[PDB]
Design a protein around this ligand. Sequence first.
Ligand SMILES: [Zn+2]
Ligand SMILES: [Zn+2]
Lengths: 190, 638, 230, 394, 87
Amino acid sequence: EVRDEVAEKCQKLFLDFLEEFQSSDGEIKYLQLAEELIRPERNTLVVSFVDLEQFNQQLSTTIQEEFYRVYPYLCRALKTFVKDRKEIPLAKDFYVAFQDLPTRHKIRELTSSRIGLLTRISGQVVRTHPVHPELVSGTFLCLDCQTVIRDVEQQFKYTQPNICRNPVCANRRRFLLDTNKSRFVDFQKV
Amino acid sequence: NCELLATCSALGYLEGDTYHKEPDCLESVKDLIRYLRHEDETRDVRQQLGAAQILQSDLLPILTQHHQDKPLFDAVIRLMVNLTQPALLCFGNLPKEPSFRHHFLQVLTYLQAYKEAFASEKAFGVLSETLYELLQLGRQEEDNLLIERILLLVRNILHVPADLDQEKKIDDDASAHDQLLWAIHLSGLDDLLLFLASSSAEEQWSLHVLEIVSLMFRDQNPEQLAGVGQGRLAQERSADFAELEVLRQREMAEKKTRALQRGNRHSRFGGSYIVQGLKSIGERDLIFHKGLHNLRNYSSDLGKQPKKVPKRRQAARELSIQRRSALNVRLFLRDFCSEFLENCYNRLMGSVKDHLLREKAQQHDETYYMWALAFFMAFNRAASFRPGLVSETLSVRTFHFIEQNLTNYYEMMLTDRKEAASWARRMHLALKAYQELLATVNEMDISPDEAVRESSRIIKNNIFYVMEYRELFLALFRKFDERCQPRSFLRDLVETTHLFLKMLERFCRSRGNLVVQEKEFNFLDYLKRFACSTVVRAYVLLLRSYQQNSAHTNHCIVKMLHRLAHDLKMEALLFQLSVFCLFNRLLSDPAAGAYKELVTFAKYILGKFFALAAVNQKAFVELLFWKNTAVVREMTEG
Amino acid sequence: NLEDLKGHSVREWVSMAGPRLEIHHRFKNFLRTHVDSHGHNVFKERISDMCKENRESLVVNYEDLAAREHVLAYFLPEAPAELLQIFDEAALEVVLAMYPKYDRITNHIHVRISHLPLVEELRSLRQLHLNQLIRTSGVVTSCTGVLPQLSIYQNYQRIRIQESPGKVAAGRLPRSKDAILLADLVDSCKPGDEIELTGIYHNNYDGSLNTANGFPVFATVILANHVAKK
Amino acid sequence: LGQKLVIWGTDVNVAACKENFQRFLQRFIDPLTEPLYMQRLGEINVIGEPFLNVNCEHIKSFDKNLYRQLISYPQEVIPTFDMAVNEIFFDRYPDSILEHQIQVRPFNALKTKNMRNLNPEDIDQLITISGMVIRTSQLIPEMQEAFFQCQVCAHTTRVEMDRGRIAEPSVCGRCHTTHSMALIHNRSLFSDKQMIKLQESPEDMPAGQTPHTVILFAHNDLVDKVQPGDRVNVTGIYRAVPIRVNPRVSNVKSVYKTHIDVIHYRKTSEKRVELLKELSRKPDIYERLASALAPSIYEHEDIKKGILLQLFGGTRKFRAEINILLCGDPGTSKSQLLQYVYNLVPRGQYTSGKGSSAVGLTAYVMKDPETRQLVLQTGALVLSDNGICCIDEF
Amino acid sequence: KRNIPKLDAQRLISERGLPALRHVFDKAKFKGKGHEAEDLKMLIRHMEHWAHRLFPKLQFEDFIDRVEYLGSKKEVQTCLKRIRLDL
DNA sequence: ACACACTCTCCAATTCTCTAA
DNA sequence: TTAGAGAATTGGAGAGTGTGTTTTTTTTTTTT
Ligand SMILES: [Zn+2]
Ligand SMILES: [Zn+2]
């Protein structure tokens, strides 16, 4: 029922930007780059912030001012755009990353004023930790009634269903993770 | 599971892009039919066949590549017609039992997959070519059966609903229904629908074509569809930037109001105040623990959680939302709609009305006929073509027919408790169509032609002289209920009432008095019937959403309310604490500048209240309770 | 035809009765018919040597499995825990056909794969590789005692391997992983050994990692299938 | 009706208190022209800072009654003074735009209490103390307004929160399903906090004893204004809090812990160009500038000239800067000379070749005493890049 | 045990109900023409205050719904005839 | 001794049905 | 036409049960 209108408008306009932004020469820039995502190893598409700026200042400003709230809707736009063009296994998921941002902030300027806003910094690395797999969307099997629960999205602590859609089950604990149809992403700290 | 998965493999196999059938494939599909003939009531064979994905894997290649074998083609078509039959028809209802509910949902899931699989244009192309050949015969019973099952196959494919909850697509993107509809155009299958609708001897198929066409157009309303044009690209682009701008602005404003209301120091800074002289529920003055700024807009209830409602106490709600399809689809639909109205409407309506009158033992669904006339009359009026394009429907028989159907639905909704929800839906559909008839006769008055104006006077004369149309609105208002109907029904009813009163008033002006079914009429006496306090309660409920109501809705309701209060002098019926709470919220909102008529009417009636209250202190008690007509009139006497 | 992947994941496909039986027959026929360049039967000799010494463990080479029955070689790294199960069932009855009294010595025989081509470096493992067959190298640093594990009871041992010194860049630090050895693989190594390890890459939940990092991040381990010194 | 409000546990009227502060603003001219704080009000209207300082001595000299009420009840009085200032600020200059309401910061000029003499009688009074800073925490975020969203139907609601307690919804009002509302952390609204640790200064100690310490909390604007080792005067509210016996159990100890809630703290051109041009155009300027160095040293002029030339240096491949060495007996004035020139240049550094020195010449890596994570400690030579580094017992 | 409080007709006709209502407004004052909005705010303020005396558990809108339903009962009419005119 | 999670019970609120005012 | 009494179904207020919880001796490399 409820819909975040601001987010939906951003999704529509960002899709139009990807499909309509012609180069200095005449071909659609990001359409050509998108073809590399067919490779198994590739997940992330890089977008230039100044290119985004040329389409409309309102969209540029909204993205920077509302980034964390809006970000998952940009991924859906790229997912849709790629799916149109060439065949890829449908279980794969795609990511958007921005660069050429016009400004820079000091470490001591990073304060709770700008939680959630798009930002750029620089520093010197002291230590770097191993790679791990991180769960983003779980699939669970409810054992007492043999029914599957899909796209259980995670937050900081590991969360799961406790009662299923199937009403006769009366379960609370007997749930099994499908580690073959769940999906993960690579994670690293520095 | 494994038994069917092993045996179903018999049909054939795929070599790159060439499909090779087995030499006993016909006997194999006969065995699949033998499985279905002894299927369980849970539809287990269908779920097994769906799990094995036989339709997607083999039947589509067989139909596309091996259709030259007409007996095999016939077998495959009838098999998938049985398999694709809608789940509601297979189970007979949405099941109450959780096991059968799960099976229903799984069957419907496989049907959704079949609908996606059928999106290949080659299937529609072969079907259209086959049907084109069959109609050239001017035939055997098996040929008629093949026509029948072709039409029913595309009907079944269209019928199973799209999961908008699964798709979650933005407007102007194509849903499964949209893509399949575009494939109908790309195949040219639509041309055969227009042939069947326009050809007189094909009347037996026209009843099916009505269901096909009405299934296609469901997402697009005719007014906005008539609106479209080639410049819509820039229009949507610019408008969307403006919408995004106002949305951002509204969030900013609301944030700042909250920011000023909150104190500046942190949440543990403390303090405590005594409100000297303001006694508690207890024997002593109130102690206030919150921040100083909060007292500027204090109400004691602010700390309380809402009352927890019982499960069965909840009101009705909508299971649907407004949408727009892709511009290509919108343009195609507009062309098809224009061509149907140009060539097919009057002939098809005559045929369908003939079948509904004759074939009562067959129990044909009248709601489609009413849907189609409601849709095409609205499109025709939105385009403002000559009334001659919709000639067949412009007669008294339609009003009588729909009145008896609507009153039958009303009586059934009251009596047949076990199906009152569906009877309410049927009744709502009938009301919508009737409103379009009234709008049509209203429109032709402002035409330049005296002949159609006289015809308009004849129709309106019969409608106002007879009892039923003027009594019906009061019958619906009397039995409106929050579990029975959602607020959309109430909006349609009150707007139709405003239109009916407008035309009634214009008709009464023609002579010194109007006589009706037998008594001398009086417009004010008729309006006095609506002074029932239940009707006002329904009006107040509709007024709570004035910001979400349409401009036309707000105009209609406020016009009727002022007339009823002022000219009937029943003003004190509106002295209610619930209404006064709504007035308080109304005058508090900074968006009040958009609602000048409503705020001025509110201040006017509150002025009447305070003028009375200055004389008579009993008004503060009466404000808590609903009035009988005698009490409304007695309050001014005291 | 076994190759007809339609409407199912390969894990589901090889679970079906038809494909399971085709895989079973193909591996059995491969065992009986495989010949060397001289026209000698390879597995007659190898099985007879296994039986004479009571060793209860059969080694197969990936290269000539691929060369003769490529369809099985194609499925094998994608669903190892399925095809290896079918392979064990098929090998035991060939052994009993040749040596009918061998059930007196053992009731199970394990097939072990070798010369798998897709070698990976011990720091280039990613989530792309989960639940697949891989090959890596490193030096053992930690090694538990041999302990019994429930199933009946069988031997179990756990080890830790890290990148070989001098294969890390100058002045930086090595990565490492844990591995599990079951049944006849225990005491196939001791600390300081350099080994070549073929196994299945596998992951599971751990509350300590989630509480230490604040994100729902899992732990991983390698199930050994064949171990050999380089 | 605001005139009915009276502070709890006492008998002081809020509205009267607000009026008295406004009279002070409208009347207090500087005793040493519109009122003094009205000058600052006109200035802050254009400067755009969010705060206004007031000296307590002006309040006292204007009215003893208001001063007594301020010191007694700062928690209720200070928000009232905030409201008074904002009323004047927006009654005047109504077209001016400002993002926040103005804060008022009353401050007392000099120390009133030794931090050894704070007693249970002082709790929640406004006090001022002085000392030496020891350590400063990392910045801490703090919740202000929680954001709740329904899992079932995506309906949202906001909860203003009550002295650290959140009023979690039990049921979604739109879809009537219990226990379906979830807190969205990064959509909530936050504020800044920092913890500072302070010690009594060595002058005011009893003989031979070790020093006492206190903990200070600073919010929003003040959250990063001091560093370790320096010395300050602070004004704040003296708070007291109970502590729990264990993280699970809800029992509390019978002896409370106290801290200071900070409100204010204080630390203890063409004309120049033309003067420099004229002075540079004067004869024997090289001798004069050299003579200006180290007046305690009466005869070593050419050494002073060499040091002056090192301070001026060359300009930018080849090393443009200058290096100098001083040799001879110990006990000679050379160390004093190093300390003198060290104090003349902004990027300067000073240390000894002895292992007992305070900071090393060599860079190294160590564990942070707070987080126990690694930190890279660069040496004095690196820190003095584009600067002068003085080395003793070389 | 389980002595749950609730607002029924006997509670509604008690002193904190209609009698207290009858006496609360005789101290109030209203400004009238061109000030109807402010008068309404004052009226609602007193009404919310009064309602909280009668049953301090419900929100004001929910309380109004209970009073709207409960006004139907003959028991409150037996008191209304006294409140109107005089006892 | 003092907190979560789970299971279970009995009391009486909400609606259907028949009846009088 | 409007309202109250007797019978049936259902929510949840409440109780009970199970479980968890700086400071000393010895080696090794490299600095002296
Ligand atoms: Zn379940
Ligand atoms: Zn909800």
